[PDB]
Amino acid sequence: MQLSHRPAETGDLETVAGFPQDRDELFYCYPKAIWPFSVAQLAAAIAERRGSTVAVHDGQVLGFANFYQWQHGDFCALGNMMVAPAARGLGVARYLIGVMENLAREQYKARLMKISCFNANAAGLLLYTQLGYQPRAIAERHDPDGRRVALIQMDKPLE
Ligand SMILES: C=CC1=C(C(=O)O)N2C(=O)[C@@H](NC(=O)/C(=N\OCC(=O)O)c3csc(N)n3)[C@H]2SC1
Numbered sequence: 241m242q243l244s245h246r247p248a249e250t251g252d253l254e255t256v257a258g259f260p261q262d263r264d265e266l267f268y269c270y271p272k273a274i275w276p277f278s279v280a281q282l283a284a285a286i287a288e289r290r291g292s293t294v295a296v297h298d299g300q301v302l303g304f305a306n307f308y309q310w311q312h313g314d315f316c317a318l319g320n321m322m323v324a325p326a327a328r329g330l331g332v333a334r335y336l337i338g339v340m341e342n343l344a345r346e347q348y349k350a351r352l353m354k355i356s357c358f359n360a361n362a363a364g365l366l367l368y369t370q371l372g373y374q375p376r377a378i379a380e381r382h383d384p385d386g387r388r389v390a391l392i393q394m395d396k397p398l399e
């Protein structure tokens with residue numbers, strides 16, 4: 241993969257909104273969203289968040305992420321990490337996490353990145369572990385069926 245990045249643009253939204261393939265996937269990247277996902281929901285997230293970024297390969301938007309918390313001199317918390325179905329497992333999420341870590345260090349002078357991952361998302365837990373994140377706490381949350389799920393709160397020092 242040769243990947244590049246840029247700020248998300250309006251033109252990208254229909255593409256990104258296409259990424260979650262089912263209710264679970266949507267929940268694991270955007271738990272406040274309601275299925276079906278839509279550009280309006282995505283745009284509403286972008287408006288209340290920062291650092292909405294896309295990753296591009298061979299002319300295709302393949303990844304998206306942003307921050308849902310940002311505290312200058314302190315930390316940022318990664319949100320909305322989404323990858324195109326055809327590009328899963330090819331390093332897009334790793335690439336984007338690295339871009340977002342740089343953004344957190346550079347723009348927000350953060351010392352820490354926080355990532356919170358739902359317990360069912362084994363691939364996410366394993367990837368963030370590979371990238372140097374450690375688990376710090378587990379919180380109870382509820383899924384759309386009202387079932388209890390565990391949110392694994394991980395973090396990583398940035399420099
Ligand atoms: C005239 C040709 C058209 C073509 C064509 O077939 O040549 N289309 C497509 O392939 C359809 N694309 C979209 O719905 C689209 N994103 O696709 C989602 C994805 O990439 O997964 C979109 C619409 S508005 C916007 N900002 N993005 C239509 S658009 C009309």
Ligand SMILES: C=CC1=C(C(=O)O)N2C(=O)[C@@H](NC(=O)/C(=N\OCC(=O)O)c3csc(N)n3)[C@H]2SC1
Pocket residue numbers: 268269270271272308318319320321356357358381382383391
């Ligand atoms: C993986 C993506 C995540 C995203 C994201 O990028 O969208 N998050 C947010 O915006 C954070 N909000 C929640 O924890 C949350 N809302 O209440 C917030 C609170 O209690 O403090 C929630 C989750 S399930 C439920 N019933 N509520 C995390 S959860 C991880």
